[PDB]
Amino acid sequence: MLTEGISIQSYDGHTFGALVGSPAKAPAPVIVIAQEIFGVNAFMRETVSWLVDQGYAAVCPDLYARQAPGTALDPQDEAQREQAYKLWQAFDMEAGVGDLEAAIRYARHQPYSNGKVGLVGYSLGGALAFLVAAKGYVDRAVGYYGVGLEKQLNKVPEVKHPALFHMGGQDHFVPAPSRQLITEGFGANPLLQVHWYEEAGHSFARTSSSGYVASAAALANERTLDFLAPLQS
Numbered sequence: 001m002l003t004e005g006i007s008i009q010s011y012d013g014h015t016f017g018a019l020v021g022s023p024a025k026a027p028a029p030v031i032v033i034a035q036e037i038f039g040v041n042a043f044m045r046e047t048v049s050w051l052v053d054q055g056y057a058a059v060c061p062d063l064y065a066r067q068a069p070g071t072a073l074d075p076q077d078e079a080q081r082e083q084a085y086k087l088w089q090a091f092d093m094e095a096g097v098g099d100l101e102a103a104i105r106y107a108r109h110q111p112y113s114n115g116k117v118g119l120v121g122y123s124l125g126g127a128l129a130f131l132v133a134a135k136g137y138v139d140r141a142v143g144y145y146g147v148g149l150e151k152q153l154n155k156v157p158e159v160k161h162p163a164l165f166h167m168g169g170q171d172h173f174v175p176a177p178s179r180q181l182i183t184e185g186f187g188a189n190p191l192l193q194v195h196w197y198e199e200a201g202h203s204f205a206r207t208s209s210s211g212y213v214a215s216a217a218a219l220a221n222e223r224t225l226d227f228l229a230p231l232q233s
Contacts, residue, residue, distance in 0.1 A: 035124060101137050
């Protein structure tokens, strides 16, 4: 689902929609939410809703719009999971970072904006959150279980604003030696935080996932809120 009429333009000229939640009380910081591999779907709407309840405004951009506008896939449907994986495999990460940059700029200047912008990303969006943190576009970035973070560690010294990452210890995407590389690499930059959730794998914060772990989700989520709270004012 997207908010009808919302259109955001990327540096290269491409336009895309977004699901937008205005804040309960303005002004407020705006959180750009970077999707999982399923488009802008139920978990994204639930996340917009949660962040509104917590005193933010939120913008969730349609990152698959370069491939197919308005994709919103049910992660419990096998056929739709297959299409999600195809879209993720074809996804242009660089263009994704550009689209997120444009959504961050949009979020800075809405009439409800206090001028501070955060980013929270899950799965695909967690990978994008790290790349955005390296570019420095946001005041604070948060990623949940991005894939391939051990391949991006050369970017660690580029991070100049705080970023927080939540990783599942049982995530099959992240074997032990990758976890060790990430832990060591992140330790070199105190602006980065990474927490490991030993009893949780991928997608642990989404109730509809077979990987959902309530204790891990709750701890991660309260850490996220405490980390974003300084943006409020």
